[PDB]
Structure formats: structure tokens, C-alpha cells
Amino acid sequence: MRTLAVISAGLSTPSSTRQIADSISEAVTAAVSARGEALSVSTIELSELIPDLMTAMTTRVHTTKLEEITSALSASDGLVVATPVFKASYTGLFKMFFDILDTDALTGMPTIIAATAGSARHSLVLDYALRPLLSYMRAVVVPTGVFAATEDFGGPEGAEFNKRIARAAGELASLIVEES
Amino acid sequence: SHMRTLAVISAGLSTPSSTRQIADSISEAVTAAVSARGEALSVSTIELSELIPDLMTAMTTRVHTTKLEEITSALSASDGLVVATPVFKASYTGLFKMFFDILDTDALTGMPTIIAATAGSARHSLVLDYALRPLLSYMRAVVVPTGVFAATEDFGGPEGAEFNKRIARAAGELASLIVEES
Amino acid sequence: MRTLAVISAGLSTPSSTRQIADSISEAVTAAVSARGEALSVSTIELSELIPDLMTAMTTRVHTTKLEEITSALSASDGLVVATPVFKASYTGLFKMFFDILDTDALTGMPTIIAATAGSARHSLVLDYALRPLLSYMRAVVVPTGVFAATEDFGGPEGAEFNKRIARAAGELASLIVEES
Amino acid sequence: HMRTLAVISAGLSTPSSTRQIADSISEAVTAAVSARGEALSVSTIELSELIPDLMTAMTTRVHTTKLEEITSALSASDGLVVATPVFKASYTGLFKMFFDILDTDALTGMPTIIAATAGSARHSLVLDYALRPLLSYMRAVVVPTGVFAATEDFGGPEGAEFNKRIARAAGELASLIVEES
Numbered sequence A, C: 001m002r003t004l005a006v007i008s009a010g011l012s013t014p015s016s017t018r019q020i021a022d023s024i025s026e027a028v029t030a031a032v033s034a035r036g037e038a039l040s041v042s043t044i045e046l047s048e049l050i051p052d053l054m055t056a057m058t059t060r061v062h063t064t065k066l067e068e069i070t071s072a073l074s075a076s077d078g079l080v081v082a083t084p085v086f087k088a089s090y091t092g093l094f095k096m097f098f099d100i101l102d103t104d105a106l107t108g109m110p111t112i113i114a115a116t117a118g119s120a121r122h123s124l125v126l127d128y129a130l131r132p133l134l135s136y137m138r139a140v141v142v143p144t145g146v147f148a149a150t151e152d153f154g155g156p157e158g159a160e161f162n163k164r165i166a167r168a169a170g171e172l173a174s175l176i177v178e179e180s
Numbered sequence B: 001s002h003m004r005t006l007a008v009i010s011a012g013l014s015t016p017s018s019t020r021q022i023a024d025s026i027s028e029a030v031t032a033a034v035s036a037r038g039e040a041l042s043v044s045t046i047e048l049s050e051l052i053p054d055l056m057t058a059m060t061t062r063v064h065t066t067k068l069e070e071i072t073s074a075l076s077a078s079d080g081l082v083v084a085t086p087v088f089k090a091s092y093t094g095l096f097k098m099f100f101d102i103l104d105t106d107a108l109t110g111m112p113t114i115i116a117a118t119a120g121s122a123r124h125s126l127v128l129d130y131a132l133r134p135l136l137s138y139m140r141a142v143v144v145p146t147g148v149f150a151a152t153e154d155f156g157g158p159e160g161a162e163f164n165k166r167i168a169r170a171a172g173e174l175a176s177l178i179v180e181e182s
Numbered sequence D: 001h002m003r004t005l006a007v008i009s010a011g012l013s014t015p016s017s018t019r020q021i022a023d024s025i026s027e028a029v030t031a032a033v034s035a036r037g038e039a040l041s042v043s044t045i046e047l048s049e050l051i052p053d054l055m056t057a058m059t060t061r062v063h064t065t066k067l068e069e070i071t072s073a074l075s076a077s078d079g080l081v082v083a084t085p086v087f088k089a090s091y092t093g094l095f096k097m098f099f100d101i102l103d104t105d106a107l108t109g110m111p112t113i114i115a116a117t118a119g120s121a122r123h124s125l126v127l128d129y130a131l132r133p134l135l136s137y138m139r140a141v142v143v144p145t146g147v148f149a150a151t152e153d154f155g156g157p158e159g160a161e162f163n164k165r166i167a168r169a170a171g172e173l174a175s176l177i178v179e180e181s
Helices: A016-034 A050-058 A064-073 A092-100 A125-136 A155-177 B018-036 B066-077 B094-102 B127-138 B157-180 C016-033 C046-058 C064-075 C092-099 C125-136 C155-178 D017-035 D051-059 D065-076 D093-101 D126-137 D156-178
Strands: A002-008 A039-045 A078-086 A110-117 A146-149 B004-010 B041-047 B080-086 B112-119 B148-151 C002-008 C039-045 C078-086 C110-117 C146-149 D003-009 D040-046 D079-083 D111-118 D147-150
Touching (some): A002 A064, A016 A039, A016 A078, A016 A146, A016 A155, A039 A064, A050 A092, A078 A092, A078 A125, A110 A125, A110 A155, B004 B066, B004 B157, B018 B041, B018 B112, B018 B148, B018 B157, B041 B066, B080 B127, B112 B127, B112 B157, B127 B148, C002 C016, C002 C155, C016 C039, C016 C078, C016 C110, C016 C146, C016 C155, C039 C046, C039 C064, C046 C064, C046 C092, C078 C092, C078 C125, C092 D093, C110 C125, C125 C146, C146 C155, D003 D017, D003 D156, D017 D040, D017 D079, D017 D147, D051 D093, D111 D126, D111 D156, D147 D156
Parallel strands (some): A002 A039, A002 A078, A078 A110, B004 B041, B004 B080, B080 B112, B112 B148, C002 C039, C002 C078, D003 D040, D003 D079, D079 D111, D111 D147
16 A cells, blocks of 8 residues: 655645645545555645744754654655745745755655645746755656646636646556556 | 835854855945945844744734834835845745745835845855745845855855955945935 | 837737737836836837847857847837747747847846736746846846736726736836936 | 657757767666667757758748658657756757747657756756746656756766766656656
8 A cells, every 4th residue: 555645734724725735635546546556645734833843943853743744754655745825936834844854855756746826827836936846855746736726616627627636646646556 | 314224134044154144244235335325224134043933923823923023014114125045955945935924915015125045056046036036026025136146165266256246236236226215 | 318128029910919018118108208208119029030030049240130239229228028928938039039148238227027928827937037037137127027918908907907017117117217 | 669869959059068968968868778678769959950940930830841850750759858058047049949839749748858058057947947847838757857067067076976967867767768658
């Protein structure tokens, strides 16, 4: 059985960022299932690690809690990261979790990058911010980034969108089952 | 007017901090530049590493500490601004980003601004034009053309002197916008 | 009098790139008038300089037409750059022209940057493509960028957009009338 | 059947630094694919010798015989290496025109190594802020290891590390190239 790590960084409840994140992981689960394999998904909510993250900034060593999360992340077979859009780019908190990760923490890690906001005017946040981020860490980011614009759900656009979620999931799924 | 103000954000986490060092060089040159234009400068340097609790309190809640309220209010009231960030994972720091996330939509509208970053080498010098610039522009801050990327491995010598002249240029650019305001 | 240079890289006829570029120049012309000055607007069409660009690549020296264009460009008070969006970024023909300019060709040039596509999902091309380009040439680009999403015209959003054009116009005008 | 590699260089000078790092990548890719038990065919295109063909294809949707074989072999290739000198802090306009000229689905799923060169490394991020977004938009799969050749840092420990980086990029591409059906 494979493992799927998920990092959602929203601060709301219910969180839109968590929404799309689940739509993607579930889709990935279905895709890995279609390739004849079980998938264990473990979702990490950054809003729930603010204290530990804070500590890792003023201090140098990480809390047992944080240490367990990052070790499990680097052991997962696939990764999906998601984030809301503050100031036309990814969240500060979002970038903080990654600033704390070891240099070789995600090397070779299959990833789906995703963001969300009202409109799609900030969709290039994917290839101009998250992609350069995950690329720096040598993670192989599937070609299909998923930018969820809540204002465009329902109707032909939503069908098209849910269809794009599928492609991304297929892309990641292929990369996950191919691992030895 | 009766003494121009300058705000300086520095996101370094080491002691001593290389980010605070280029930040100081920048504000010192700005101080000289405003002096050359006949005026006086007041500088407010804000170390993000000293605001961690106030910052991550504004995260898990929507209200600011007296300290943060004083910082953000002066920031918006400032005539000039300088932002310096170390480079983590090939871009600005999450902590640096957090501060901005916390600001009002229009906290920095029209704010003359010099963007700056530092690291060992200059391989990531484009972090200015692809990460900090877009961020400051999105908030409608007017960013002076001369960004300042300090690669510590290239200090001193023919390179080090050329870099110090560069700081002055950014300083001059920012100084002009500063004394222009009325 | 003040001179405003305009670079339009449109290829179609009529050109949506020339349209936004015109709505831009016009607005600037007006705004420069409310500040008590006359503006001479000279619009350049890059599609009409094909054989020249094609020569400045294979050879090192420019042609009369091109040499008289760059000179007039580097001597204008203001500037406006417009371009279509091919492959989710600015035009190559567009980039080619700037590549041909001298190092200090636009140093200190007050500038408006703009682009035009169907939707707005590629609007970040302003800050992640043109801004860096113009900024590298030490040009001073007004905070207000103009992205004409031809579909979002008219209606409420259409109203907000015409204002944005005026804001940028006003911005450049001030820089223009401030130059002696 | 012999695997195919398409290469695109946008250097203007002669000799050309762009062409040189492109040859290294392609040669390194040939060894990597050789190590995996297969043979490799390499098609290297020099954009500065295709200018008129490009201008025509842009102004008109017509392709010269030369450009027709170039674009066809391109979409038909198993792997792609793209290289560009750095002008005005980004890729060449000539470089961009070429990709503007292609069909929207020309490189869909195409294994790719993006590269660029200059004197220093101050502009290395052109890779992940210009070329990468470009290739991604065309849904090509660009291997993690981009190659930026700072001609001022060859030789000694630095270059010794750079050649290894070239190898890592070739391995990544070679893998993608040979697992294709």
C-alpha cells in the first residue's frame, strides 16, 4: 500500500483550500485504485502547526510533533500541496513549512501543486510561485497544476474543472505506482 | 516634511544577521541621500524575528498587539520603505511573506520602495524581479528600478566597490521620491 | 511639448493590442492635458518592422528605419508597451525588439505595461514577464499595469477597467510632466 | 526503434556558448540512453539559421519545407533539450518566437531538459521563471534538473560539480525517454 501526503494551508472553517485538497487526494485515490493499489492518505493542516512552526523560527530544533510530520512526509510516496492566495501568491505560513524542511526533504517526490481563490486572475501563482518552489526541492511536479476558482464551479466549467482534477490525479497516480 | 521617515523591514534570523547588515547599509545611504537633498531622515528598523509572537498571534486571530499596531501604522505613514529578506528555498522567507499578508489591502499604496535580498552567491539574484517586485507592485507600492541583491561571497575588491555604488543609486532613487512627496 | 512612444506588437487586423494601446495613449494624452501640456503620440507597430528585426539578428548593424525608431524611442518622455499573449506570456516578436535595444535605451523611461488576451487567467504576465523586462532595463514602470481581458469588457467589470486605464494614465502623466 | 532527441539552440554567435552547453547536454543524454540499453538519434536545430522560415510561419501560417520537417520531427521526438542565451534577463525573442510558432499541442507530454547560458550565474532563475513556465504551459514534462551554464564558473571544483549536474539531467531525461512505448 502506498502513501499520499497532503499539505493544506487554509485558515478558514470550512476551508476552501482543504476542499480542493480533498477533491484531489480522493481523485488520486481513485486513480491509484484503477491501477490496482490501495492508497493511505494523511492530510496535514498547517493552521494546526503554527505554534511548532513558530518555535522552529526562534529556535533551531523542532518539536517532536513537527519532527514526526516532516519525517512521514519524506516517506510518503506522493505529495499534494495546496494553498489559498494572499497578496497574489502563496501564503506566508505555507512558505514557512517549506523553509523549515531539510534540503533533501522532497527530492524526487511526485507532486500535484494546487491553489485556490475567488477568480482565476491569479492562476499563474502555480507556475510562477509553487512550481519554482517545489522544483527547487527537486520534486517532480506533474504538468497539470490545479487552480480552483470557486467563482467558476458548476456547469460546463465545473465539469471541465473536475476533468482537469482527474488528469492531474492520473499523472500523479502513474508516478506513484511506478515507484519501486 | 519636518523630517522625513523611512521604514525598514528585515527578515533575517541569524545573529549577527546578514539581512540586517545590507538593510542598514541601505538605510544609511538613504539617510545620506536625503541629507544631500537638504532634509533629515528618521529611520524605523523592524526585525521580523522580534515579532514572531505578535505576528503568529495575528495569524491565529485577527487582532494586532499594541506593538504591531504601532509598527503597521507608522509603516503606512512612512515616506519611504526598505525591505530585506534572506533567501530560503529560492525565494523570500515565509516569515517575510507573513508580515505582508498581515497588512491591510492598502497599507502600502503609493509607497516609494527599495527591494533587497541577500545570500552567499548571486545565483538567485532574480528573486527580486520575480518574487519581491510582484509582491510590492501588487500592493501598489512604487518600487525603485534598482533592486539590491547582496551576495556576500562577492564583497570587497573590484566587485565590492561596484556594489556599494549600486546601493547609492537605489538610495538616490528612493531619496528623490521621498523628498518629492508633499 | 511632450513625446509619448507606443509599442504595439499585435499581428491581427483589426488588432486588439492596438486597441488597448490606443485607449492607453489617448487617456495619457488627456491626462497630460489636464496638467497643462500637449502630447505628441507616436505609435510603433512591430509587425511593420519584420525585415528590420530579421536583419538585426543575422547581422550586427541596424537599418535606417530601425535606427530612427530606437532613437525616437529613447528620446520620448513617456512610453507604453502593449502585446498579445502567446504561450501564456509576451510575444517573441515583442521580445526580439527589446533584445535589439542598447543597454541604456530606456533608463529612466516612465512606462505603462499592458497585454491583451481573451480571459484574465494569464494577467500575471504583467508582473512576471513585462515588469521584469522593463525593470531590467532600469525603466520606471507605473504600479498600475493594464491587462485587457477582451471578454470582461462592458458591465460592472468593464466599468472598473476603464478606471484602471485612467489611473495608469494619470500615473505616467505625472512622471511625464515632471520631466523638463 | 532508435530513440530520438530534438535539440533547440538560440545562440547567435559563432562559436556559440548556447550550442556548446546544448551539445554537452545532448552528448550526456546519448550516454545516458546508451547506459539504458538503447541507441539515440540527435536532431540539433539552430534558430539563427531558421529566422526567415520563422518570420514567414508567424506572419503566415505557412511552413517552409525546412520548418515542416523540423516541427514534425519535433512533435515526433521522444526527448527534447532546449537552450537559450540570456538577453534582457530572460530567454531570447528568437527563442520565444519558435515556441509561439508551434501548434498548441506540439510538446504535450514531451520529456524535457530546459537550459540557458550566460557569463555569470546572477540570472540562473530564468530557468524556473521563464523557460519552465513556458514548457509547462505546453504540458511538456520538464525534468527537475535545469541546466544553467555560467561560462565564468567552469573548471575546478565548481565545473566538476556542474558536469555532474549535466549528467543528472541527462539521466532523468533518458529515463523518461526509454520508458515510453
